[PDB]
Amino acid sequence: LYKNHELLKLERKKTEAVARLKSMNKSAINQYNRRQDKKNKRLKFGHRLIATHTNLERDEQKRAEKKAKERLQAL
Amino acid sequence: TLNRKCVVIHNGSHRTVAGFSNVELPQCIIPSSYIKRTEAEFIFGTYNIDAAAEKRNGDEVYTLVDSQGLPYNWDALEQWRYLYDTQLKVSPEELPLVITPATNGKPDAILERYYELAFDKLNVPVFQIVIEPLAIALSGKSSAFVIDIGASGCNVTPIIDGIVVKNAVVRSKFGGDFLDFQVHERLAPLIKEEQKRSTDVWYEASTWIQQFKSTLQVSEKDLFELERYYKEQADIYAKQQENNPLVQKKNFLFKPLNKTLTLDLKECYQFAEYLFKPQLISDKFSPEDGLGPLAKSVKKAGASSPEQVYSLLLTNVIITGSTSLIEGEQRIIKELSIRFPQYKLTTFANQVDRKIQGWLGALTANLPSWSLGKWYSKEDYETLKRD
Amino acid sequence: FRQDSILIIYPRSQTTLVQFGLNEETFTVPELEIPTQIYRTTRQDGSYTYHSTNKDNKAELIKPIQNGEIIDISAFTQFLRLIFVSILSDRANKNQDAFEAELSNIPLLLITHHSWSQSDLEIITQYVFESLEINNLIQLPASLAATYSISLQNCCIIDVGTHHTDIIPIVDYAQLDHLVSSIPGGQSINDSLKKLLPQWDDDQIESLKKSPIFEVLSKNSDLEFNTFWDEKGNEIKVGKQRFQGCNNLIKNISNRVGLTLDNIDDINKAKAVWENIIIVGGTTSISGFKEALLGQLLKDHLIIEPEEEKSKREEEAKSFVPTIEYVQCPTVIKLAKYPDYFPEWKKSGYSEIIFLGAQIVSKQIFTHPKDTFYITREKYNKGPAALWDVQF
Amino acid sequence: DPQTLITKANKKESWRYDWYQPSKEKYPFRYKTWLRNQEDEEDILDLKEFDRR
Numbered sequence: 001l002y003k004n005h006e007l008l009k010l011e012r013k014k015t016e017a018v019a020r021l022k023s024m025n026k027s028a029i030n031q032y033n034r035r036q037d038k039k040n041k042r043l044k045f046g047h048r049l050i051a052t053h054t055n056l057e058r059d060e061q062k063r064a065e066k067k068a069k070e071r072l073q074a075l
Numbered sequence: 076t077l078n079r080k081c082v083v084i085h086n087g088s089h090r091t092v093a094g095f096s097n098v099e100l101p102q103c104i105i106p107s108s109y110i111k112r113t114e115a116e117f118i119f120g121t122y123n124i125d126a127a128a129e130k131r132n133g134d135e136v137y138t139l140v141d142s143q144g145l146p147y148n149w150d151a152l153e154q155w156r157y158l159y160d161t162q163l164k165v166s167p168e169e170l171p172l173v174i175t176p177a178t179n180g181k182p183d184a185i186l187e188r189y190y191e192l193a194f195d196k197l198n199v200p201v202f203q204i205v206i207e208p209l210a211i212a213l214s215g216k217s218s219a220f221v222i223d224i225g226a227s228g229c230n231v232t233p234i235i236d237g238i239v240v241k242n243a244v245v246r247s248k249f250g251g252d253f254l255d256f257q258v259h260e261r262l263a264p265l266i267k268e269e270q271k272r273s274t275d276v277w278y279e280a281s282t283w284i285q286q287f288k289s290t291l292q293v294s295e296k297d298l299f300e301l302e303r304y305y306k307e308q309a310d311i312y313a314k315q316q317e318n319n320p321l322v323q324k325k326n327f328l329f330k331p332l333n334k335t336l337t338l339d340l341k342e343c344y345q346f347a348e349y350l351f352k353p354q355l356i357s358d359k360f361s362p363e364d365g366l367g368p369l370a371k372s373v374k375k376a377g378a379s380s381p382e383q384v385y386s387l388l389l390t391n392v393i394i395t396g397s398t399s400l401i402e403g404e405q406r407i408i409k410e411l412s413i414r415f416p417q418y419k420l421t422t423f424a425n426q427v428d429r430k431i432q433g434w435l436g437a438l439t440a441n442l443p444s445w446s447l448g449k450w451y452s453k454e455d456y457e458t459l460k461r462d
Numbered sequence: 463f464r465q466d467s468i469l470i471i472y473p474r475s476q477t478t479l480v481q482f483g484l485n486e487e488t489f490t491v492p493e494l495e496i497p498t499q500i501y502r503t504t505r506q507d508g509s510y511t512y513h514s515t516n517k518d519n520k521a522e523l524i525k526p527i528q529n530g531e532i533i534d535i536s537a538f539t540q541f542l543r544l545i546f547v548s549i550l551s552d553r554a555n556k557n558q559d560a561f562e563a564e565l566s567n568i569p570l571l572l573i574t575h576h577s578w579s580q581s582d583l584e585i586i587t588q589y590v591f592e593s594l595e596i597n598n599l600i601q602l603p604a605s606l607a608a609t610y611s612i613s614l615q616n617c618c619i620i621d622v623g624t625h626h627t628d629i630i631p632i633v634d635y636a637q638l639d640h641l642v643s644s645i646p647g648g649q650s651i652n653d654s655l656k657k658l659l660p661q662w663d664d665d666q667i668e669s670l671k672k673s674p675i676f677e678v679l680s681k682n683s684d685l686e687f688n689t690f691w692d693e694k695g696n697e698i699k700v701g702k703q704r705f706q707g708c709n710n711l712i713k714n715i716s717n718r719v720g721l722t723l724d725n726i727d728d729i730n731k732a733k734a735v736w737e738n739i740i741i742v743g744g745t746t747s748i749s750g751f752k753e754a755l756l757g758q759l760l761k762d763h764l765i766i767e768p769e770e771e772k773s774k775r776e777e778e779a780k781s782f783v784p785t786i787e788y789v790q791c792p793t794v795i796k797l798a799k800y801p802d803y804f805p806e807w808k809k810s811g812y813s814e815i816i817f818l819g820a821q822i823v824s825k826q827i828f829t830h831p832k833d834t835f836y837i838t839r840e841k842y843n844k845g846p847a848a849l850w851d852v853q854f
Numbered sequence: 855d856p857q858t859l860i861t862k863a864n865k866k867e868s869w870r871y872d873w874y875q876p877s878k879e880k881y882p883f884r885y886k887t888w889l890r891n892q893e894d895e896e897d898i899l900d901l902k903e904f905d906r907r
Contacts, residue, residue: 020447021217021237027442029215035099039634041834042854045826046635049613052826053801060488060803078874078887080580080847094639095580097850104640122643124721164579169886201883286724290789326788333768335786400727430727445876452883496904514899540896547856548899550863565863584888588869597864845869845888 076443081171082163085207085434086152088140089226089251089397092434093158096173096441101434103162108138108277109151119157127278136273142227142248144176144207149188153196171450172202173440175210175433177232177244190456203440203448208232209239210436211395216423220373220388222407224396226251229350229366233376233388243375247366249350251288251398255280257346257356258287265336266329287327293403294344297352302341347401351410367410385418392422397430463598463828466564470820471545472573472604473498473538475527476624479817482549483564489821491810499525500541512540529626530575530644532582539589542572546594569598569836571824573607573816576630576642584846591842600827600836605630605637606854607819608740612801616734618723620715620755621816622743623647627711629718633731635854641722645714648745654707659700669693670704671748678708678750680757708751716758723763729791736763736791738798747813756797765790856898867891 081096086107094101103120110118110126113133118126126134139154141147159167172193186204193199208221208230217237223230229247233240259279263269270276294301302321309319321341329336351367353360362368377384392411394404404424412420425432442448465484472479472492480494501521503511513521526538554560570590574583583601590596608619609632621628628644630637648671655667670676673690682688689699719739726732739759741752767786775783800812807818827835834852841848868891873884 017237023444024213024237024442024447025215025217027447028213028439031439031441032215038099038853042635043615045835045854046610046613046615049610049822049826052822053612057801057803060805064805077876078847078889079876079885080887097580097847098853100636100639102639121725122718122721165581171883171885200885201881282724286790289727289729290791326786328765328768328788328790335768335771335788427728445881446878450881450883452881454882493906494901494904495906496899512896514897543856543860544897544899547859547897548901550859551856551898552901554859561862566865568864584871592868593860595860595864839866843867845867845890846871847888 076441077445079171081173081440082159082165082167083434083437083440084155084158084172084174085431085437086140086146086154086174087225087433088138088142088144090430091139091154091158092431093162094434094438095163096438101431103158104431105158105162106281107140107154108136109154110134110136110274117151119154120161121281124278124281127274127281130274134274135271136277143178143182143246144225144227144230145182145185146188149192153192155192155197159197167197167199170200171440172199173205173437174202175205175207175437176230176246177206177208177239178241179244180241186451187459190451190459193451194453194456201450201452203450205437205448206239207433207436209234209237210439211432212393212436213237214432214436214439216391216393218387219391219393219423220376221393221395222399224250224350224366224394224398226397228253229369229396231369231372233372233384235376235384235387240376240379242378243372245369245372245375247350247369248364249353249366250396252280253349254288254291254346254398255284257349258284258291261342261346262287262336266332266334283330288401290327291346291401292340292343293347293350293401293406295403295405295409298341298344298348301344344403347403347406351406366407367414370411370414373415382417385415389415389418390421392420394422394424395429395432399424400429463567463569464564465825465829467566467568468571468824468828469546469549469568470571470573470817470824471542472817472820473527473541474575474623475525475530478541478545479814480545480549481817481821482553484821484825488806489804489818490806491814492817496545498527498541499523500537500544502537510536512537512544514544527575529577529646530623530628531577532579535582535585539586539593542586542589543594546596567598568596569600569824569828570594570596571600571602571820573820574601574603576603576605576628576637576639577644583849587837587842587846587849591837591839597839598828598836600824600852601849602820602823603637603854604628604816605632606635607816607823608742609635609819610823611815611817611819612799614738614740614798616731617738617740617798618719618735620719620739620741622711622715622741622745624649624744627715627718627743629715629722631722631726631735633726633728633735638726641725643718643722645718647711647743650711650714651707651745651748654710655703658703658706665693666698669698670700671707673704674749675700676704676748678712678748678754679705680750680754708748708754711745712751712755712758715755716762719759720763723792732791733794737794737796739796740798742813742816744813747811752797756795759795763792764795765793856896868895870895 083094083096085092089107090104091107092101092104105120112118139146139148139152146152159165193202208223212219212221212234218235221232221234228250231245233243305319305321323340325338325343327336349356351365353364354362373385373388376388394407408420408422428435465486468484470481476498478496478498479492480496481492501513501516502524503517503521505511524534524537526532526534526541532538550565553564590599605619609617615635617632619630624647626644627647631641651671652667669692675682675688675690687699687701689697691697723732723735726735741755746752765788802808804818836852837848869888870891871886871888874887874889875884
């Protein structure tokens with residue numbers, strides 16, 4: 001009885017050390033994946049604005065073109 | 076997660092990194108040194124290089140962290156005021172503090188000086204101290220052989236199941252700062268040049284010398300052998316008919332004299348070879364002071380079976396540190412693989428973050444429970460103060 | 463969200479640019495420019511009250527933002543409320559059904575400055591949700607507004623103020639805080655000129671700087687003397703001094719840019735940054751200034767064969783010369799290309815282009831469902847800390 | 855009334871920045887943070903002057 005209680009208590013200490021080691025890994029793995037996510041959502045927002053810019057540019061070009069076209073053939 | 080925000084400070088021997096736990100990068104990376112300009116006065120911060128370029132007498136650079144990676148000038152360290160005032164811009168009294176090397180256990184006197192600084196002087200609410208190799212490893216490994224190549228030298232730290240093996244902790248004396256010295260001594264005659272003169276030494280180390288290092292290579296295999304081989308091969312191409320890779324030239328624009336410096340690839344490989352075979356500078360260094368032999372630390376880990384620890388460590392090798400970014404991990408691996416042929420090595424390294432991986436480690440302050448770290452409170456100090 | 467409803471505020475040391483509602487056809491340069499100050503009366507018993515005018519000469523004049531830094535966070539928040547309220551009143555008169563339409567859901571985009579505390583940013587967040595009772599907030603860094611006004615992943619912002627210039631590298635759409643810095647701007651030109659023209663006074667010198675005949679060189683340049691007119695209509699003639707006074711500033715900025723970009727660790731990022739230098743701020747509208755600044759960065763930092771060395775090699779080959787390749791990343795330096803398709807902005811120059819950055823971001827963000835980049839009431843209900851879950 | 859203008863537009867907790875003492879009962883230390891509160895816890899300028907013209 002005394003031996004098992006000592007051994008069981010030692011094993012409980014081992015589980016606390018193990019869960020703690022494991023918990024810190026889980027926290028660590030989640031944090032790393034969060035860094036990658038933020039980095040991706042950022043790069044993704046940037047790369048979309050480029051596209052937005054391209055459309056703003058196309059729209060302007062159409063607008064200016066319609067303006068010049070009337071302007072050049074009319075007083 | 077927890078409703079808190081920590082200040083995370085890392086005082087390396089060369090760089091100091093500071094920022095809040097709530098964002099992915101530090102607010103500032105500043106030198107772990109300062110100018111004392113003379114009524115005395117203390118300059119901190121990377122650009123504040125301005126003062127150095129002024130080349131004013133009485134200006135002198137002093138350091139905060141010894142080669143142990145430990146603070147040794149505590150009046151000067153109380154830098155912290157500068158960080159809190161001008162960079163984080165927050166009273167040190169508000170937020171929990173997290174600060175960071177592996178030791179053999181003896182100097183661990185430090186904790187007291189930290190109490191005095193954190194409590195007596197700054198009035199910090201509470202602080203944690205993380206062990207650099209341990210945090211870096213955690214920031215998904217519980218057991219790892221952590222090989223840190225920084226400015227002070229190489230620091231080799233086995234870590235088994237979250238615990239640090241202190242007697243197997245090993246600190247080489249040759250690293251980044253050593254490389255600065257050699258780059259300088261070797262290039263000296265092409266740039267004219269060939270404590271108290273600390274200011275120029277420092278400014279040069281922080282400007283052209285830093286760029287030069289970033290633009291050195293480490294040869295994959297013992298260089299003397301690479302040479303004999305490349306020669307032996309070159310003879311045959313030549314003899315055979317009737318290109319030795321070491322003859323490639325590399326060009327560096329040296330700004331202070333608007334002058335090109337050209338090295339052949341061998342001379343580029345030569346600088347880091349010293350980290351591995353320091354017996355090649357002086358006759359006073361044994362091959363055992365070299366990074367490869369410094370095997371020693373793993374074997375001392377096996378002395379807590381051994382061919383098990385060996386196997387654990389070698390499947391979780393972590394390579395880290397500013398200097399570990401010099402092109403050519405592969406030599407540390409080749410050097411490890413041949414001292415331990417029976418075992419398969421698997422190494423891990425941030426490929427991006429290594430310059431500040433120590434601080435990144437401390438940051439990963441984002442652990443979900445207060446019970447995950449020892450947090451010293453003003454109490455702890457009171458109780459130590461008793462007899 | 464309603465586009466009528468988007469509110470952008472860009473506070474700076476001297477003035478604050480403001481806009482309420484986006485045009486939908488093209489972006490207009492902000493028309494509201496309110497001096498950045500508030501009056502602070504002190505009421506016996508300690509407390510403070512804040513007014514738009516010196517009330518019966520009882521109030522003190524507070525200038526909340528100085529050198530871009532917030533020096534008085536309470537007067538600053540009071541100043542925002544003062545702007546915000548004014549906008550509500552204005553719209554509420556003109557239309558009267560406004561509280562069901564234009565004023566029913568007002569998202570706020572506040573352009574921040576690199577120097578603002580986290581503590582300052584949280585307090586501002588609290589103020590916007592609690593005092594102004596607004597429900598949606600983006601705090602957009604000035605640097606990013608800059609890069610979004612053809613969206614550059616890697617670049618450097620040189621923002622020239624009156625008393626200071628900020629230098630801010632951006633890598634992978636992220637402001638590199640540890641590289642950021644300011645040097646202690648436009649007044650330097652004034653000061654340089656005072657030394658060169660002792661018998662002039664401040665208003666005379668300021669008038670020259672703002673005149674058509676002041677430029678940085680690197681046809682007016684043909685004339686020994688030229689003429690310009692006082693603030694008060696007085697004609698003033700001036701010699702070579704009108705091509706001076708910008709140099710000391712240009713050199714200082716350049717030395718800083720060099721030390722900064724040299725501390726970018728990824729040589730491949732670095733190359734990209736050097737190829738997208740962005741220069742903004744009032745000073746920069748001085749004819750020739752940007753190009754002169756570029757010219758200096760080239761003179762000081764470009765990776766290229768030293769001329770004497772090259773001249774030898776060409777003599778030697780008299781007896782074709784291959785280009786010497788250097789290992790230094792920054793072998794090419796360029797100003798980032800402006801977008802030419804914002805007609806109103808082209809017309810008025812791009813010294814204030816940071817604001818166009820914000821017009822673009824706000825339209826993107828607020829006219830699309832995803833709430834990833836701003837704080838919502840839902841989120842506010844983490845509090846100010848909510849702020850750090852939507853940083854870019 | 856400006857305050858009522860603020861009240862009628864844009865249509866709910868409040869936070870304070872204060873000392874907090876975590877527990878495991880309570881840890882010995884304090885630190886400031888943003889805590890949520892319990893149940894129980896001037897003028898106008900004329901634009902146009904500032905419009906550019």
